PDB file of C-alpha atoms in Angstrom:
ATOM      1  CA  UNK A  25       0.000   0.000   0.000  1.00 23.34           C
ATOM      2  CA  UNK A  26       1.378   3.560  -1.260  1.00 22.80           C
ATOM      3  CA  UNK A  27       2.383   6.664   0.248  1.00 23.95           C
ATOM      4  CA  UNK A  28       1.467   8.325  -2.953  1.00 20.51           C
ATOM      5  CA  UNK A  29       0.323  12.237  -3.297  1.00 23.56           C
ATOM      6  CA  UNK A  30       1.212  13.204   0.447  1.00 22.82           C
ATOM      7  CA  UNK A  31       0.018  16.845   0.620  1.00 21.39           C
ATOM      8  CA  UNK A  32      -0.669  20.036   2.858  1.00 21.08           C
ATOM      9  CA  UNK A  33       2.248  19.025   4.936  1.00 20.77           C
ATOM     10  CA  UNK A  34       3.541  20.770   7.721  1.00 21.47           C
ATOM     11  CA  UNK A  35       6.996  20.253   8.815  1.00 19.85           C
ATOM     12  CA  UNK A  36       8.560  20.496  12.630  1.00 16.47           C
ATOM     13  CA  UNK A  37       4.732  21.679  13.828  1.00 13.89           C
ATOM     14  CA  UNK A  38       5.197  22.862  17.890  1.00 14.33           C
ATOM     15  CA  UNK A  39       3.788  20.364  19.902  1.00 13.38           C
ATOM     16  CA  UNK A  40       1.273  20.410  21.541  1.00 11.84           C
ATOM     17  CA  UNK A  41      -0.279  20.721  17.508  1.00  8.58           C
ATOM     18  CA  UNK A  42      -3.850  21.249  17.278  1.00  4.86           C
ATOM     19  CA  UNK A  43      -4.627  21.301  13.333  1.00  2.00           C
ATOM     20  CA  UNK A  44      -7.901  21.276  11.022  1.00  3.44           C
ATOM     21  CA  UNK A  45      -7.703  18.308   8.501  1.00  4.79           C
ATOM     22  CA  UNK A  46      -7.895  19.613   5.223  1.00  3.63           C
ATOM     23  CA  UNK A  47     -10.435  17.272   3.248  1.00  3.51           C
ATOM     24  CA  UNK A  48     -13.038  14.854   4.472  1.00  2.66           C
ATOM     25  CA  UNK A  49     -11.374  11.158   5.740  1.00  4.16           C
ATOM     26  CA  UNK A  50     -12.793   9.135   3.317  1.00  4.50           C
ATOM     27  CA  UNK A  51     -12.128   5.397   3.117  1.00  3.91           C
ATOM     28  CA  UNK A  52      -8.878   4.571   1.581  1.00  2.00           C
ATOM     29  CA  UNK A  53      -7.283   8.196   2.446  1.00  2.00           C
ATOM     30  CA  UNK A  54      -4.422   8.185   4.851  1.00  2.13           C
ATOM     31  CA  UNK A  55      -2.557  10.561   7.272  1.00  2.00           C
ATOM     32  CA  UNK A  56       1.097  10.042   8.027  1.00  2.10           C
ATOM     33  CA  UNK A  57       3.010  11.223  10.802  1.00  4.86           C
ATOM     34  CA  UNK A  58       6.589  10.775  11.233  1.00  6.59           C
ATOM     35  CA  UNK A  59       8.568  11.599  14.069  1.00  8.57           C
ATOM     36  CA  UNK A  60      10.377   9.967  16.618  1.00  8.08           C
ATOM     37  CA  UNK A  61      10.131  10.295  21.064  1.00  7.01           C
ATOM     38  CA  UNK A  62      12.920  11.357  23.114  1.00  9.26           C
ATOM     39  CA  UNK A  63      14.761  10.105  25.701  1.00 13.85           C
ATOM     40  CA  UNK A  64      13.049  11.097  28.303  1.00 11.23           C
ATOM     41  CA  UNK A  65       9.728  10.581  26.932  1.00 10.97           C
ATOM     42  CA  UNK A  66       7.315   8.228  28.476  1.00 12.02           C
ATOM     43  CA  UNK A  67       3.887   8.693  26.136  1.00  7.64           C
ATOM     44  CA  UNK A  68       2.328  10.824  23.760  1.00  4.65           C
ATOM     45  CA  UNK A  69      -1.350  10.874  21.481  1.00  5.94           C
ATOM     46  CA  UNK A  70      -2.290  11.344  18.446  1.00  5.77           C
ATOM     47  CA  UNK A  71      -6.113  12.639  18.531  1.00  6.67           C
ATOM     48  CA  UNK A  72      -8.508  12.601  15.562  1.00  4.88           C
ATOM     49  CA  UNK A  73     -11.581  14.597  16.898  1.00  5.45           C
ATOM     50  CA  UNK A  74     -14.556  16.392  15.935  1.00  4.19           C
ATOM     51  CA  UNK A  75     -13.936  20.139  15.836  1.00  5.62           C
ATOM     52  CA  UNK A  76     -11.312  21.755  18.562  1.00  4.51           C
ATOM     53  CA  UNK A  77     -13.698  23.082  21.239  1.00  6.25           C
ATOM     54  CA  UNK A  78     -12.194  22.756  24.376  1.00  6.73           C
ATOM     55  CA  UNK A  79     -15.397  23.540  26.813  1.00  5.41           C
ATOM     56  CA  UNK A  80     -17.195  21.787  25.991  1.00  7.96           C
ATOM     57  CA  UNK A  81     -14.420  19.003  24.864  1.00 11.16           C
ATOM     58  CA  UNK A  82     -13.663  17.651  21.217  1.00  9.52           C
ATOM     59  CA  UNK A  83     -15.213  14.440  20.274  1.00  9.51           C
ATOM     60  CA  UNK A  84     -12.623  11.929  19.448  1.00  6.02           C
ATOM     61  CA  UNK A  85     -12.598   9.644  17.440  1.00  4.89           C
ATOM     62  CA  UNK A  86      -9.396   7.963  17.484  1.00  4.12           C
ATOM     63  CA  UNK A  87      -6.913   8.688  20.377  1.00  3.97           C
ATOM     64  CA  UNK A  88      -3.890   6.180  19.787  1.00  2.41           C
ATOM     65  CA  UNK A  89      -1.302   6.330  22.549  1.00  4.02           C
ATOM     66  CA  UNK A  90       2.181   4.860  22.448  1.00  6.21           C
ATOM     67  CA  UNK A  91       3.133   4.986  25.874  1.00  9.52           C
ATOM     68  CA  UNK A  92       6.968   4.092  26.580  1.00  6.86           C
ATOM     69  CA  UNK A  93       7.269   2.281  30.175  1.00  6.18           C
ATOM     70  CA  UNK A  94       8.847  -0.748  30.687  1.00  7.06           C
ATOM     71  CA  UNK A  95       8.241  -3.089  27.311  1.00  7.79           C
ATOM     72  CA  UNK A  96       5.438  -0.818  26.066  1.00 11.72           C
ATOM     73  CA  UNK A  97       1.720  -0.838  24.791  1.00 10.40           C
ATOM     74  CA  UNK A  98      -0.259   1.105  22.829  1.00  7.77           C
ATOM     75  CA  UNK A  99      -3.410   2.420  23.987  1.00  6.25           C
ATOM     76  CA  UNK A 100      -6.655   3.173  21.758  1.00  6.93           C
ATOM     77  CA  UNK A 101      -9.723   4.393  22.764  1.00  5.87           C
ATOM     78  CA  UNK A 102     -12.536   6.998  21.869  1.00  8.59           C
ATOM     79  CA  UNK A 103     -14.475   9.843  23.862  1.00  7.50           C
ATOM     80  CA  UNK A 104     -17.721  10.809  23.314  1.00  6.97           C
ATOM     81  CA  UNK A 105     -19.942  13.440  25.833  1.00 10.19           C
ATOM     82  CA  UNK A 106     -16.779  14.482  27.577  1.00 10.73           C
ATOM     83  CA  UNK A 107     -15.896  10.855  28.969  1.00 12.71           C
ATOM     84  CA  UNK A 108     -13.695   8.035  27.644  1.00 12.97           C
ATOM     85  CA  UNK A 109     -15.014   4.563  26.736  1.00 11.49           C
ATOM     86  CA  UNK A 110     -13.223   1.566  27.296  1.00  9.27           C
ATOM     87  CA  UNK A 111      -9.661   1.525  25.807  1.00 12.03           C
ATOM     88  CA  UNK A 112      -8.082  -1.222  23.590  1.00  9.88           C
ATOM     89  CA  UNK A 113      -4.558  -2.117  24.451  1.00  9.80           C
ATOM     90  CA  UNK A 114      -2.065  -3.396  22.082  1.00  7.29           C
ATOM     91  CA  UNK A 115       0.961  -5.100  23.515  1.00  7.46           C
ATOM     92  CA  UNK A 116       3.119  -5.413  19.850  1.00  8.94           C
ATOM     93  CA  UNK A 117       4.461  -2.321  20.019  1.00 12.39           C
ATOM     94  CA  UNK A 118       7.059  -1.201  17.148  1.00 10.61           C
ATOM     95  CA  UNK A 119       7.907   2.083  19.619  1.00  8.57           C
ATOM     96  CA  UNK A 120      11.011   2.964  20.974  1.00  4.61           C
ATOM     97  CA  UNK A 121      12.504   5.887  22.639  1.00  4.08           C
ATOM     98  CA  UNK A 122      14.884   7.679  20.228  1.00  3.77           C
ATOM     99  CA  UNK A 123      13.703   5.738  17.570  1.00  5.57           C
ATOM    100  CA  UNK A 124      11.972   7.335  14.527  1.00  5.98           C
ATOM    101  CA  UNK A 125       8.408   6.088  12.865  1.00  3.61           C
ATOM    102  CA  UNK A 126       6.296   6.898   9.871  1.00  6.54           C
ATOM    103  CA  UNK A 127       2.562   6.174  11.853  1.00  9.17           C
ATOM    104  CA  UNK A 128       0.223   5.971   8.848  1.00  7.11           C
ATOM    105  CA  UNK A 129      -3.771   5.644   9.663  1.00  7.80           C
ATOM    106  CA  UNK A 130      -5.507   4.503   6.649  1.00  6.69           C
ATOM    107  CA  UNK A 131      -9.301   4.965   7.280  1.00  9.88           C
ATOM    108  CA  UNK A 132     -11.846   2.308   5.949  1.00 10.57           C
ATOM    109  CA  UNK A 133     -15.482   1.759   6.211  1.00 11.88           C
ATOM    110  CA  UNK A 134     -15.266   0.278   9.023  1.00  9.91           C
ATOM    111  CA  UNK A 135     -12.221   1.055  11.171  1.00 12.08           C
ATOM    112  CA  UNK A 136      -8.978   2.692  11.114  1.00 10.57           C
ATOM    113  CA  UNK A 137      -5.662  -0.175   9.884  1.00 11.41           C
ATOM    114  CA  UNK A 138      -2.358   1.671  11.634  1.00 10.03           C
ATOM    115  CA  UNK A 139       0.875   0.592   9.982  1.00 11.11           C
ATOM    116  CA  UNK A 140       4.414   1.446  11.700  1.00 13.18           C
ATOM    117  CA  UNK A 141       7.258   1.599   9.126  1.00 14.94           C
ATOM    118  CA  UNK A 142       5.870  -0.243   6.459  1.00 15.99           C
ATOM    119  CA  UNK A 143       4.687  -3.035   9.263  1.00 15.80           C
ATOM    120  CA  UNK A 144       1.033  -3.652  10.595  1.00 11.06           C
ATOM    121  CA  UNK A 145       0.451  -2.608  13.701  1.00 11.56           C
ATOM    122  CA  UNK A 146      -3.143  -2.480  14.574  1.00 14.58           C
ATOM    123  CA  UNK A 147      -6.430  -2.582  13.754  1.00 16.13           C
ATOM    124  CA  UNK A 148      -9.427  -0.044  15.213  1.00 18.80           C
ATOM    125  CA  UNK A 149     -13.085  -0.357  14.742  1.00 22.71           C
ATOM    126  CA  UNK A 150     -15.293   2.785  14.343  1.00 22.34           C
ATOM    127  CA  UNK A 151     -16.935   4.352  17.578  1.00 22.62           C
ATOM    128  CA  UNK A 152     -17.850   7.386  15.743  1.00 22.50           C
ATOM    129  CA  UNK A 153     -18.457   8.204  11.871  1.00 23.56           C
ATOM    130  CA  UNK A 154     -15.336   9.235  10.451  1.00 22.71           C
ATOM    131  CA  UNK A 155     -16.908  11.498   8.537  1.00 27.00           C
ATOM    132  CA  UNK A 156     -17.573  13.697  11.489  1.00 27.03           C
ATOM    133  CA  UNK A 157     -13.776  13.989  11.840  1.00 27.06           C
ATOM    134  CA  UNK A 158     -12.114  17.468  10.916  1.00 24.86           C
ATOM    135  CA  UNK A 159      -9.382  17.992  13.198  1.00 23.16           C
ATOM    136  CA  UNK A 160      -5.781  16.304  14.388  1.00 25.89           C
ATOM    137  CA  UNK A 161      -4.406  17.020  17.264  1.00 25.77           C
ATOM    138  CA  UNK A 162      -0.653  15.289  18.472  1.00 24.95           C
ATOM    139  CA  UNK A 163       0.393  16.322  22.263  1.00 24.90           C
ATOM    140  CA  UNK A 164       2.931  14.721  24.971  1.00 25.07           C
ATOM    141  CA  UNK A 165       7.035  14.791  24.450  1.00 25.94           C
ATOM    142  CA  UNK A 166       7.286  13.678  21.072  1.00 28.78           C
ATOM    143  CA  UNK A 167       9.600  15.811  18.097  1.00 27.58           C
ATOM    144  CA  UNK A 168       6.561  15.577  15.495  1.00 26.80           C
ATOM    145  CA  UNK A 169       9.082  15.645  12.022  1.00 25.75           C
ATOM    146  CA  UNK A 170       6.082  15.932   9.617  1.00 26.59           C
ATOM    147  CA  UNK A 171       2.390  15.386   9.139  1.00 30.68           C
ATOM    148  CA  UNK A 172       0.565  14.713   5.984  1.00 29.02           C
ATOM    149  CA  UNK A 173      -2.276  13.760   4.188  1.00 30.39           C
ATOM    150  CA  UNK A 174      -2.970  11.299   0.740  1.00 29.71           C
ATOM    151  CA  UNK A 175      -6.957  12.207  -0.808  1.00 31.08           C
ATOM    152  CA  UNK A 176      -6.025  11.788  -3.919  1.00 34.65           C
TER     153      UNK A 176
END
């Protein structure tokens, strides 16, 4: 699967990044983040959300969390009304302190697919209609090298 016509990319954004998506998420279109966590980081998210309102709070639909403690996980989940449903862990982690990764969520019908560097990593069934997402937001210690999106 191709990493064809990558556009409206931002490089080095400041983190915490709160950004509006350009185009609707349509199945098959993907967004691709590449970065990597420093040494002393222990987590960070990735947010896809419904608007940026802060009171009340964002929908969102996809929060995926690396987080960097011991051998690691990854933690998914969704929040909807201001609270947090129950999250999905995922123990085959490809994260590592210092080390870089291209994160690219490809959005289908029916969930998100996550690859890490060319390599599965997990699968992420739809809580919310993707189509109500609009917005990306990517906070925690993390040096965020680019984001980008493929629509066409």
């Amino acid at each position: 699967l191709s990493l064809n016509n990558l556009q409206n990319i931002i490089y080095n954004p400041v983190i915490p990044f709160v950004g509006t998506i350009p185009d609707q998420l349509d199945p098959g279109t993907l967004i691709v983040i590449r970065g990597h966590v420093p040494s002393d980081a222990d987590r960070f998210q990735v947010d896809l959300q419904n608007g940026s309102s802060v009171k009340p709070r964002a929908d969102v639909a996809f929060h995926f969390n690396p987080r960097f403690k011991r051998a690691g996980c990854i933690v998914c989940n969704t929040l909807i009304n201001e609270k947090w449903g129950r999250e999905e862990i995922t123990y085959d982690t490809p994260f590592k302190r210092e080390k870089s990764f291209e994160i690219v969520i490809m959005v289908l019908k029916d969930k998100f697919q996550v690859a890490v560097n060319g390599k599965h990593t997990l699968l992420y069934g739809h809580r919310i209609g993707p189509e109500k997402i609009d917005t990306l937001g990517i906070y925690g210690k993390v040096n965020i090298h680019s984001i980008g999106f493929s629509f066409s």
